[PDB]
Amino acid sequence: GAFLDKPKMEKHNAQGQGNGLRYGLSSMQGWRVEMEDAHTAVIGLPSGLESWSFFAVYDGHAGSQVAKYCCEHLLDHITNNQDFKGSAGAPSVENVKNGIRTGFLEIDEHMRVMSEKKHGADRSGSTAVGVLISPQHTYFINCGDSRGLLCRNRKVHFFTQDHKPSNPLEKERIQNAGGSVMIQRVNGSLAVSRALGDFDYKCVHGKGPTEQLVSPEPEVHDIERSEEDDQFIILACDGIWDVMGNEELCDFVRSRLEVTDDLEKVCNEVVDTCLYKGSRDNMSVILICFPNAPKVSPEAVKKEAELDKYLECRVEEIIKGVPDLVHVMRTLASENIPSLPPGGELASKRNVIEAVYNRLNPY
Ligand SMILES: [Mn+2]
Ligand SMILES: [Mn+2]
């Protein structure tokens, strides 16, 4: 299968600000032979929704086609249907939720007809996770096993529930559609129960679009915004979540925000940390900060400089037969060094350690 001999570490970054928001994002191919993640990040939506913003991560499988079409058109499919448009002037909460549902079903069918029409060869699919942010609400959207969370008052206030085939209601739909869940996979193949695309899994006669083996139906949750307490939102594919839990990553991110306000850098730190914790998948993360996100702290910046210098000295000493980097890391780990970043741990300091190691053993 895939797997490069060495991971592609190149970061693709973007950032932006507006509507009281700031964001950064990072995508990295990592160990995989292809990059099949995509993302959307837009502040200010068309058609009278200038005060709105939209962010999403798409984890494509068996190709990038579906993920790429979604990252460019999911939003307009959501906002440009009668369900979303309700309505008086501003969409009600129901307009928004129904509009998102219709947008997923409609883009799915749209891609299906395009593929049938142009004799598409690909059999790809994609997850989608995102947030539609209005002046007063954050609407979390989830379809698949990517995941998003909201940090409010230093805690995980909300996170999306991953759609896995073994989940009781998912298993039930799958069985009723003539399939089975083998371990964690639909018919022993697909590890997600919900996705756009995967049209081979949506051919069950006598079942509606949301009753197929794989469903395009999103789960939507309206969270009323709190100007005082809302801190940040994280959206990421399973390349991140496979190796860091909700509270770990939330704690980690807060730790990094106390040290820098460069959101691209924070996202890069998350991605590298997850690579160093063993993630061999494509990785994409979007970090969206609200006005009361944690601020850079002079003491936090100092502590980090102290930790980095401490690590540099340890490496100098450990290096003295000249151990390889793997062995230096192993030694460092056995020392149970205090004050490492929460969640990120030693893996989150590997770039610092490797930089020193490289200076001392450049060949
Ligand atoms: Mn993928
Ligand atoms: Mn993935």
* DSSP-assigned letters across all residues of 183-232: TTEETTTBS-SB-EE-GGGS--TT--GGGSSSB---EEEEEE--TTTEEE
Of the candidates 242, 277, 294, which is a domain's last residue? 294
Looking at the structure, tell me whether residues 98 and 18 fall in a common domain. Answer: yes
Looking at the structure, tell me whether residues 139 and 202 fall in a common domain. Answer: yes
88/8 Cα distance (integer angstroms): 50
108/98 Cα distance (integer angstroms): 15
Looking at the structure, tell me whether residues 32 and 117 fall in a common domain. Answer: yes
Strand locations in the chain (E): 12-18, 21-28, 37-45, 49-61, 125-126, 128-133, 137-143, 147-152, 155-159, 181-182, 185-186, 196-197, 219-224, 230-236, 283-289
CA of 37 to the centre of ligand 1 (A): 6
Ligand nearest to the backbone CA of 38: 1
Q: Please tell me whether residue 354 adopts helix, strand or coil conformation.
A: helix
Looking at the structure, tell me whether residues 207 and 356 fall in a common domain. Answer: no
Looking at the structure, tell me whether residues 19 and 144 fall in a common domain. Answer: yes
Show the tokens assigned to 158: 């909300």
Looking at the structure, tell me whether residues 303 and 264 fall in a common domain. Answer: no
354/78 Cα distance (integer angstroms): 45
CA of 127 to the centre of ligand 2 (A): 9
92/104 Cα distance (integer angstroms): 18
Q: Please tell me whether residue 289 adopts helix, strand or coil conformation.
A: strand
CA of 135 to the centre of ligand 1 (A): 32
Ligand nearest to the backbone CA of 37: 1
Which residue do the tokens 């947008």 mark?
A: 103
CA of 68 to the centre of ligand 1 (A): 12
CA of 184 to the centre of ligand 2 (A): 15
CA of 238 to the centre of ligand 1 (A): 9
CA of 243 to the centre of ligand 2 (A): 12
Q: How was this structure determined?
A: X-ray
The parent domain of residue 314 ranges over: 295-363
Of the candidates 241, 268, 294, which is a domain's last residue? 294
User: What is the arrangement of strands in the sheet containing 230-236, beginning at the earlier edge strand?
Assistant: 12-18, 21-28, 283-289, 230-236, 147-152, 155-159
Looking at the structure, tell me whether residues 254 and 331 fall in a common domain. Answer: no
**Start-to-end Cα distance in the chain:** 32
DSSP state of 295: P
Ligand nearest to the backbone CA of 280: 2
- Determine whether the annotation assigns residue 37 to a binding site: no
* Total number of domains constituting the chain: 2
Looking at the structure, tell me whether residues 288 and 338 fall in a common domain. Answer: no
For the chain, how are helix, strand and coil distributed in percent, rounded to 5?
35, 25, 40
CATH number of the domain encompassing residue 348: 1.10.10.430
CA of 190 to the centre of ligand 1 (A): 12
Looking at the structure, tell me whether residues 196 and 339 fall in a common domain. Answer: no
- Determine whether the annotation assigns residue 30 to a binding site: no
Distances (CA, A) of 187 to 32, 92, 280, 289: 24, 39, 24, 40
198/205 Cα distance (integer angstroms): 16
Q: Please tell me whether residue 303 adopts helix, strand or coil conformation.
A: helix
Looking at the structure, tell me whether residues 354 and 272 fall in a common domain. Answer: no
CA of 355 to the centre of ligand 2 (A): 28
Distances (CA, A) of 82 to 51, 112, 119, 136, 220: 20, 21, 30, 22, 18
Ligand nearest to the backbone CA of 36: 1
Angle between helices 298-318 and 325-334 (to 10 degrees): 120
CA of 282 to the centre of ligand 2 (A): 6
- Determine whether the annotation assigns residue 281 to a binding site: yes
Q: Tell me: cis bond preceding 87? Omega within 30 of 0 counts.
A: yes
Of the candidates 267, 294, 321, which is a domain's last residue? 294
66/107 Cα distance (integer angstroms): 10
Burial class (CB in 10 A: 0-12, 13-18, 19+), 314: middle
CA of 59 to the centre of ligand 2 (A): 6
Looking at the structure, tell me whether residues 28 and 127 fall in a common domain. Answer: yes
Ligand nearest to the backbone CA of 2: 1
- Determine whether the annotation assigns residue 60 to a binding site: yes
CATH number of the domain encompassing residue 84: 3.60.40.10
Looking at the structure, tell me whether residues 51 and 4 fall in a common domain. Answer: yes
Q: Please tell me whether residue 81 adopts helix, strand or coil conformation.
A: coil
